Design a protein around this ligand. Structure first.
Ligand SMILES: CCCCCCCCCCCCCCCC(=O)O
Ligand SMILES: OC[C@H]1O[C@@H](O)[C@@H](O)[C@@H](O)[C@@H]1O
Length: 255
């Protein structure tokens, strides 16, 4: 019921999510923003098609990342780093930038059906240089392989603003209840890795990317950490609202 509806969407569900971003009823969401959001949504897929075929050496030299030194200094400190970002802009282009300026990083992939579809997504992201760990059905437990990368002073990247299963962390998101994955907060606690909020967007015909100051994981409270994670994502999504490709149900109430 809710698990099926939670993996559907389209322009109608997009309006309901952007309604929270702008703070207006669904019918009052600007028609120009919906068009910009669908246009941004189309661009990611248009780029995801040709991204494995482009000159990644060019992309790494010419694209920039705001406050990238936040990540370098944390890797210079031997701590590892957790990069948690929302589904905004082109994050596969951001990974390309990291593969060229640092090297391969690790991530997790939901085991989609059919398997052939899942196989294609692995190939796609592996052809970009990412390490893809199966969230289920794999050889090793995903949470524990990632923890090894973090204590090994390596970066992992997690799409970390949506997880509407029984195991999601409930947080406030534009004043309403949603659920986000616990992975990012739990991995910074258990391993001490630096937890950096990350945001990607479309800067004209280019790509905008930014690393934000790492969150305080001193409390060991997954909710308090994930809530600060939600606060940062909401602050960034509000700046580039059209570049947030959330056509799926996001908030608990819409299920
Ligand atoms: C310094 C900024 C670098 C940001 C690098 C972002 C790379 C993220 C790539 C994520 C690919 C996997 C997306 C879906 C995974 C899932 O289902 O959780
Ligand atoms: O975050 C997971 C989502 O990532 C997007 O880039 C697409 O590949 C979706 O099919 C997938 O469900």
């Amino acid at each position: 019921g809710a698990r099926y509806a939670a993996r559907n969407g389209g322009p109608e569900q997009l309006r309901r999510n952007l309604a929270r971003v702008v703070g207006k009823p669904p019918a009052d969401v600007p028609d120009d923003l919906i068009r910009a959001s669908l246009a941004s949504y189309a661009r990611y897929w248009r780029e995801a098609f040709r991204l494995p075929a482009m000159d990644h050496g060019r992309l790494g030299e010419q694209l920039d990342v705001i406050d990238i030194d936040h990540l370098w200094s944390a890797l210079d400190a031997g701590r590892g780093a957790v990069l948690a970002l929302p589904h905004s802009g082109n994050w596969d282009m951001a990974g390309v930038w990291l593969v060229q300026n640092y090297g391969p990083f690790t991530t997790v992939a939901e085991r989609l059906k059919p398997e052939s579809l899942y196989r294609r997504f692995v190939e796609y992201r592996e052809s970009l240089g990412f390490e893809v760990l199966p969230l289920t059905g794999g050889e090793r437990p995903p949470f524990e392989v990632l923890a090894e990368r973090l204590t090994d002073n390596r970066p992992i990247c997690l799409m970390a603003e949506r997880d509407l299963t029984r195991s999601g962390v409930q947080v406030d998101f534009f004043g309403e209840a949603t659920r986000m994955p616990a992975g990012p907060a739990k991995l910074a606690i258990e391993t001490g890795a630096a937890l950096f909020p990350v945001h990607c967007w479309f800067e004209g015909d280019g790509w905008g990317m930014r690393v934000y100051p790492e969150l305080d994981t001193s409390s060991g409270d997954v909710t308090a950490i994930t809530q600060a994670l939600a606060d940062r994502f909401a602050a960034n999504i509000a700046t580039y609202p059209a570049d947030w490709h959330m056509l799926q149900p996001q908030w608990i109430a819409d299920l």
